Amino acid sequence: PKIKTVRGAAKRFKKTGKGGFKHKHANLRHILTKKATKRKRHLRPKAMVSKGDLGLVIACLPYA
Amino acid sequence: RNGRDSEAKRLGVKRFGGESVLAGSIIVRQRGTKFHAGANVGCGRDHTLFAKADGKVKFEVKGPKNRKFISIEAE
Amino acid sequence: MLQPKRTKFRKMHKGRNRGLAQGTDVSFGSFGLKAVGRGRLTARQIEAARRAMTRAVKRQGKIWIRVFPDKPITEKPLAVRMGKGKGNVEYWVALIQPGKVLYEMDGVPEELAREAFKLAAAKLPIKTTFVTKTVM
Amino acid sequence: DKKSARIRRATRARRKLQELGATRLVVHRTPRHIYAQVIAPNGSEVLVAASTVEKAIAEQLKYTGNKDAAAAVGKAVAERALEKGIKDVSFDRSGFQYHGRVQALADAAREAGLQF
Amino acid sequence: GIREKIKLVSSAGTGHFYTTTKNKRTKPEKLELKKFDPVVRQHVIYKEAK
RNA sequence: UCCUCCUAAAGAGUAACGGAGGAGCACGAAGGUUGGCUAAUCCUGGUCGGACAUCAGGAGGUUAGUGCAAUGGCAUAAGCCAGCUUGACUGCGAGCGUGACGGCGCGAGCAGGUGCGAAAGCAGGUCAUAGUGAUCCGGUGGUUCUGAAUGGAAGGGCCAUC
């Protein structure tokens, strides 16, 4: 049978032109009053997946 | 009733005398001001010293209290 | 039983006894007992030596003690496994390096001084020698 | 001590101008003969000075050490600085409150070309 | 943590708001800081609210 | 779990059921700026008043203080007082520090619009280092971004926040 994509992974990573992956930062959901605007502002833009965990991401979504 | 400790903050001098640095690079990480900002050097809110211009970093002693200063010369 | 008062900390590290003695000269009396060996003296040993000389001199002259314990030593209770924290303080010891002057004395004849110090040294765990105050 | 208090007062400003690295107009005030000087950023040389202590400027005003004297010195430094070439400067109170003679000197200087 | 969180609502029609904390026990009256509203790009009065 | 010192061997880091202590906050001011001021402890005189209230002078130079444990720092004061204020602002951010990663920290400078000052200038919270919890699910406000025949709506997405 063909490989099954990890659906949870497919909802959090998007593939880019050079084979990288972009993901949303993981600290901007709640408990935001006590956070400085500088830290919230920097977490807004999407970021690239690090090299160390890139191999893990490749296995999770081999098709996308 | 002991056994508690805090994660080390990795303070200390990051750039030493006589080596070129880029603008905005951290030179010294410190709790207080062991070294005071000199020329082309800025002091952060946590007393971090960073380069405000590109050049060579040097240390010197100045003032009536012989307190240490960090400067940058455009070389 | 010499012992400090309200020390900053109850326990301290074992450390090491390397190095060389500092108080190597007679400063108060005319005769003294110099330490030849290296080791530590407990408070009990210092008291025992002091009592021996005072009796020997028959409360004549002056006695100076140039060493203070100021160092707690712990000891685990019998039938106690290793670990579970530092042991409780038991006795205080003074680290002695070669050349250290232990006791000083004055106001007695040299002949009587020699036997008095010899009796004291017999109750100490370190090799000792008799010294006399030097002129400069 | 009056001097010690004054130096302590002006130390922060002097250090701020020194690190900023800009020519500064420094004024010294006394019961008579208000002085004024222009200092290079390095602080080692004086570009130009003026005051009411010299006969060249003290031969007109009735009395030295008043509002009129400050305006004359403040004006006097102006054309000298403009003639020299330097235009922008930083005013230094030197621990003197910016209220009376000091203000008059600065007001005369700024309206005479030395805007700051 | 007696200090509790409030919402500062711009006096302008825009829905933008700030969030902060205050102590109702000591300072029960409303808060009327003057802050910057980016929707209208002007400084306006902000009123305290839930 | 987090913070400070020592262990830790003069860069960083470094274990033990090793030795000492703290935090799960507080503050619309204790924040910003402008102006001004400089302690502890002693000696002498003086009603209650007395070793220790307040006043005057002298030695002293920070042994004081710094909202909270400790370390480092602090006279240009970061310590103390007063006026005016909301920069405890929005969109960014060269370049660095720190982590396996998630992440965390510092930051000149640019645009917009503000506060203090005559001005140069300072201000993107607090002398710094603890005061904190990922994702999922769901709530509240804004935004035709989407909205499975069409026009709407429901529901999702994005932004702010619980």
Range(s) of the domain holding residue B65: 11-75
Q: In sequence order, what are the beta bridge partners of A64?
A: none
Delineate the domains of chain D, giving CATH numbers in brackets.
1-116 (3.30.420.100)
Q: Identify the closest residue of chain A to E7 by CA–CA distance.
A: A33
Residues 1-50 of E with CB under 7 A from strand F: 1-3, 5, 7, 15, 17, 19-23, 26-27, 31, 33-36, 38, 41-43
Coil/strand/helix, residue D17: helix
- Planar angle of CA D35, D38, D43, nearest 5 degrees: 115
Asked whether residue B44's C-beta has any atom of DNA/RNA strand F within 7 A, the reply is yes
What is the pairing mode between strands B67-73 and B35-37?
A: parallel
Alpha-carbon distance D64 to B46, whole Å? 50
CA-CA distances (angstroms) from residue C100 to C45, C60, D113? 16, 24, 81
Q: Is residue B75 in some structural domain?
A: yes
Residues B57 and B15: beta-carbon distance below 8 Å: yes
CA distance A7 to chain E (A): 36
Q: In terms of Cα–Cα distance, which of B1, B9, B69 is closest to B40? A: B69
* Closest CA-bearing residue to C1' of F73: B32
Q: How far is A46 from chain E (nearest CA, A)?
A: 22
Residue range(s) defining the domain that contains residue C28: 21-136
Distance CA D17, CA D116 (A): 13
Is the C-beta atom of C15 closer than 7 angstroms to strand F? no
Residue bearing tokens 């030097």: C134
Confirm if D96 and D35 have CB atoms less than 8 A apart.
no
Residues of chain A contacting residue E21, judged by C-beta atoms under 8 Å apart: 33
**Chain B partners (3+ C-beta pairs within 8 A):** none
3-state secondary structure of E42: strand
What gap in Å lies between CA C129 and CA C24, rounded to an integer?
12
- Å between CA of D38 and C1' of F126: 39
Please name every residue paired with C62 in a beta bridge, in sequence order, or none if there are none.
C106
- Can you tell me the distance from the alpha carbon of E50 to that of E6, in angstroms, rounded to the nearest whole number? 5
Host domain of residue E44: 1-50
In sequence order, what are the residues at sequence separation of 6 or more whose Cβ sits closer than 8 angstroms to the Cβ of residue C54?
Answer: C63
Measure E20 CA to nearest chain A CA, in Å: 6
**C62: which residues sit within 8 A by CB, 6+ positions away?**
C28, C29, C105, C106, C107
DSSP letter (8 states) at residue C134: -
Instruction: Answer whether any strand F atom is within 7 A of the Cβ of A37.
Output: yes
The answer to whether E3 contacts chain A (CB < 8 Å) is no
Helix H, strand E, coil C: the string for B5-61 is CCCCCCCEECCCCCCEECCCCEEEECCCCCEEECCCEEECCCCCEEECCCEEEEEEE
Q: Report d(CA E37, CA E21) in Å as an integer.
A: 19
Q: What is the spatial distance between Cα D25 and Cα C95, in angstroms, rounded to a whole number? A: 67
Cβ distance D65 to D34 under 8 Å?
A: yes
Check which CATH number belongs to the domain holding E23 and give it. Answer: 2.20.28.120
CA D99 to chain centre: 14
Q: With beta carbons under 8 A apart, name residues in chain E contacting A32.
A: 19
User: Is the minimum CB–CB distance between E5 and chain A shorter than 8 Å?
Assistant: yes
- Of B60, B33, B54, B34, residue with least CA distance to B45: B33
**Residue E36 carries which side chain, given as an amino acid letter?**
F
Hey, is C37 helix, strand or coil? coil
Q: Is E42 on the interface with A (CB under 8 A)?
A: no
Distance CA B50, CA B32 (A): 15
Contact (Cβ atoms closer than 8 angstroms) between residue C57 and residue C104: no
User: Cβ neighbours of residue D16 under 8 Å, at least 6 residues apart?
Assistant: none
Helix (H, G, I), strand (E, B) or coil at E10: strand
| 8-state DSSP, A5 | P
Domain membership of residue C2 (yes or no) is no
- What was the experiment behind these coordinates? cryo-EM
Q: Distance between CA atoms of B1 and B44, rounded to whole angstroms?
A: 38
Nearest nucleotide relative to B23: CA against C1': F95
Q: Could you state, in order of their start, the residue ranges of all structural domains in chain A?
A: 1-64
Question: CA-to-CA distance for D115 and D112, rounded, in angstroms?
Answer: 8
The distance (Å) linking the CA of D9 with the C1' of F46 is 36
Task: Calculate the angstrom distance between C1' of F63 and CA of C6.
Answer: 21
**Number of compact structural domains in chain C:** 1
**In sequence order, what are the beta bridge partners of B4?**
none
Sequential DSSP letters for C75-120:
-PPSS--S-SSPPPEEEEEEEE-TT-EEEEEESS-HHHHHHHHHHH
Instruction: Give the residue among A7, A12, A5 at the shortest CA–CA distance from A46.
Output: A12
Token readout for B59 is 């240390």
The one-letter amino acid code at B12 reads G
Chain A residues with beta carbon closer than 8 angstroms to that of E5: 33
B6 contact to strand F (CB, 7 A limit): yes
Nucleotide nearest to C74 (CA to C1'): F19
A22 touches A48 (CB < 8 A) = yes
Q: How many residues does chain C have?
A: 136
Amino acid at B33: T
Domain count across chain E: 1
Total domains, chain B: 1
Q: Residue B53: name the closest of B69, B43, B39 by CA.
A: B39
| C54 belongs to a structural domain | yes
Contact between the CB of A3 and strand F at under 7 Å = no
